[PDB]
Design a protein around this ligand. Structure first.
Ligand code: HEM
Ligand code: HEM
Ligand SMILES: CC(=O)Nc1ccc(O)c2ncccc12
Ligand SMILES: CC(=O)Nc1ccc(O)c2ncccc12
Ligand code: NI
Lengths: 106, 106
């Protein structure tokens, strides 16, 4: 999927997590988020079509996703432990990463 | 210590590790390396005095050290396990990181 498609998946599964009643629901959402983030990692944002592929901006763009995935896996660990409330909190804390990358490259 | 001083510590403790007879020797060297890398992380290379402190180049410069420290800790884990030969091998593998950062910012 393109960058846009993946971003929507991420954005939509965040609210889904924000409404979840149980762990299984959070896990599903987070699992979908993880996949989309990895796939997004491969795209080249429109604001970096120029910059060479090995550009320092690009590496920061891709590195942004390794942080999101690490964060996402921690949320899954929590969801896996039945701690639904803090798996949700962990979910929110992801926005920090989201925003960070958005103001530099979006 | 300045960037230069720290780099020398790193460079010299690498050979020391390359000559070590035992684990304790590797650990000492690596411990000195870890400290110097962290301290180096704070300096601003001469080729980045201009670029703003929050510059994408700077963050890559500092991030370079988080990789070196992670690598260094893995070497210590190995040295801690008595595996002197592979703690040494792990040591060498560090050069990849060293070079990488050198050709971009040195
Ligand atoms: C964090 C989990 C996260 C969310 C949520 C998110 C959402 C998001 C939206 C809603 C858009 C709009 C896309 C559209 O037009 O439909 C958007 C756009 C971009 N994002 Fe994003 N995004 C999240 C995380 C990240 C991360 C960690 C990065 C950087 C590694 C990133 C980057 C981008 C870019 C580029 C765009 C613009 C895409 C385009 O203009 O085509 N996002 N994101
Ligand atoms: C890896 C373990 C590593 C070694 C070894 C190393 C050595 C090294 C030397 C020998 C110099 C010369 C410094 C001097 O003039 O005495 C040097 C210089 C720089 N380095 Fe280095 N260095 C290692 C690792 C790293 C890493 C991971 C970075 C980046 C995060 C880095 C950066 C630099 C920079 C900048 C210089 C130049 C300093 C200056 O010109 O004042 N090094 N390094
Ligand atoms: C969960 C988390 O914060 N992860 C990370 C933080 C900082 C980094 O530089 C990372 N780099 C590569 C992969 C994960 C990283
Ligand atoms: C041992 C090792 O390779 N570490 C790392 C690899 C890649 C990263 O992006 C990292 N980020 C922050 C800290 C360590 C990192
Ligand atoms: Ni990293």
């Amino acid at each position: 999927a393109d960058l846009e498609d993946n971003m929507e998946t991420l954005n939509d599964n965040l609210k889904v997590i924000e409404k979840a009643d149980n762990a299984a629901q959070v896990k599903d959402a987070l699992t979908k988020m993880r996949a989309a983030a990895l796939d997004a990692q491969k795209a080249t944002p429109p604001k970096l079509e120029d910059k060479s592929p090995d550009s320092p901006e690009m590496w920061d763009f891709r590195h942004g996703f390794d942080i999101l995935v690490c964060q996402i896996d921690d949320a899954l660990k929590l969801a896996n432990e039945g701690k639904v409330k803090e798996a949700q909190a962990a979910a929110e804390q992801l926005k920090t990463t989201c925003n960070a990358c958005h103001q530099k490259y979006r």
